[PDB]
């Protein structure tokens, strides 16, 4: 439960709680009743919504992509990562190291595309979503034998039903995930900087199992991450600047904050 105010009266002594040294690196722990007279106020407030779990445990769209039942793009692929979007990336990067299970949800939708084809009656569409762990064979075509999913996890889903949902545990070879990596994967120090293999989570593939109709249709899949059972270490300053890339921390220099008219102005200019 949050702390409760203690009642105090007047003072005249050599006790000096208001005077300190910020050079020590220490935050002063002064209560209001150290510098004024206060009443007794029992406080029933709770810091329940400020826990790292509640702060992080909401589903978030991290990526979406399209595919068609005919033409060049018959299937979609995406390397799993939360750095493509802005919002969950910025929340996660409040910390240096995190450790969580994942809850994964998909929202798949379809739209009829313009064409001159006639007498089009469409059957229901079933979709296949396949996760390939890093190292395994990948599908070169919609009819590739790898869709056999003998070992790779797969989820079949028919339009009109509930969204598909699955739980993924902590898969890092290291003890904790890393949001930041000051180094190289090459001992020589050459090559790409800030890149390592600690947070590699494999690729996602999506296709139509049937074509359904004699006319063209285009599907979109949206992926949602929800972190569960969270642990985090080393707090970090929030991202002041607009993200530019998914792979690195590059940015454009920006003002510390917004500007007003003067140092005594009580409004925002």
């Amino acid at each position: 439960r949050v702390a409760d105010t203690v009642g105090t009266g007047p003072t005249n002594s050599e006790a000096i709680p208001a005077l300190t040294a910020a050079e020590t690196g220490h935050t002063s722990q002064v209560v209001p009743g150290d510098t004024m007279q206060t009443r007794h106020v029992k406080n029933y407030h709770s810091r329940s919504e400020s826990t790292i779990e509640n702060f992080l445990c909401r589903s978030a769209c991290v990526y979406f992509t399209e595919y068609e039942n005919s033409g060049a793009k018959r299937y979609a692929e995406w390397v799993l990562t939360p750095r493509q979007a802005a919002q969950l990336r910025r929340k996660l990067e409040f910390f240096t190291y995190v450790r969580f299970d994942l809850e994964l949800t998909f929202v798949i939708t379809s739209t009829q595309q313009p064409s001159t084809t006639q007498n089009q009656d469409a059957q229901i569409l079933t979709h296949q979503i396949m996760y390939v762990p890093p190292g395994g064979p990948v599908p070169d075509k919609v009819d590739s034998y790898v869709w056999q999913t003998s070992t790779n996890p797969s989820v079949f889903w028919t339009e009109g039903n509930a969204p598909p949902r699955m739980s993924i545990p902590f898969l890092s070879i290291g003890n904790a995930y890393s949001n930041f990596y000051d180094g190289w994967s090459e001992f020589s120090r050459n090559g790409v900087y800030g890149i390592n293999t600690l947070n590699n989570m494999g690729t996602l593939y999506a296709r139509h199992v049937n074509a359904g109709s004699t006319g063209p249709i285009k599907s979109t899949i949206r992926i949602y991450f929800k972190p569960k059972h969270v642990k985090a270490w080393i707090p970090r300053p929030p991202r002041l600047c607009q993200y530019e890339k998914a792979k690195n921390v590059n940015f454009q220099p920006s003002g510390v904050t917004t500007t007003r008219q003067s140092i005594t102005t009580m409004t925002n200019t």
């Binding site: 000051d182 180094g183 120090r189 002041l240 940015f251 220099p253």
Partner: protein, 256 residues
Amino acid sequence: GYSDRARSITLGNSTITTQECANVVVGYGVWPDYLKDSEATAEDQPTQPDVATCRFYTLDSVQWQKTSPGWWWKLPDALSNLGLFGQNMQYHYLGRTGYTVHVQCNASKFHQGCLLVVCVPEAEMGCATLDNTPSSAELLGGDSAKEFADKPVASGSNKLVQRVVYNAGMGVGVGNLTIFPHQWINLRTNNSATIVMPYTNSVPMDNMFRHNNVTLMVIPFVPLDYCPGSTTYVPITVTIAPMCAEYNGLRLAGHQ
């Protein structure tokens, strides 16, 4: 009867005494130690040099001027060529250590100014060119301090670093760097600053040539100012002691 301003730190064959110290900041409340049996993964027997590696090394001095933006040092790189600490990281594949960082700057009462001394974990920085990544030579200076810029750096197909001071090279507010272990050198009150950092990583040990676990930043928030006739050359000196250092994976010397 003594003064909390006077402190002495003894490590190996070295000893530092300061007559004007705020106190000591201790990491995250964690004193450095050795890796325990229930936290290890590598199976060979480690080496522990102790007094030979755990001792104070003093680096080059920088000059605090009236317009200086600030300086940075990668801790593992800073001592990579210094003594048996350097030799032991040269012949081994894995290392593990904490630090004691002591910053020194004296001046008279008239001299004014304030410096922030901060130890930042995983200080991953950004390139001026958005497509490229900062060059190793630009990011690391083993025997020399790396300098911040005040003006923004120009991006023209290069591998430079956005060394803007108000973004701390990491594209974040510089005033919010206080979450990290830190102390302030205020010329009117302080003389030196001390931080004791433990080993911070997501893995139990790491290779010490391709990864820098921590970076030391010294940034003047209030500029240096003196009236005419006062000393004009004011240096800053950095002294670093490894703590509880251990090494695994002995092989031929070199990094490739």
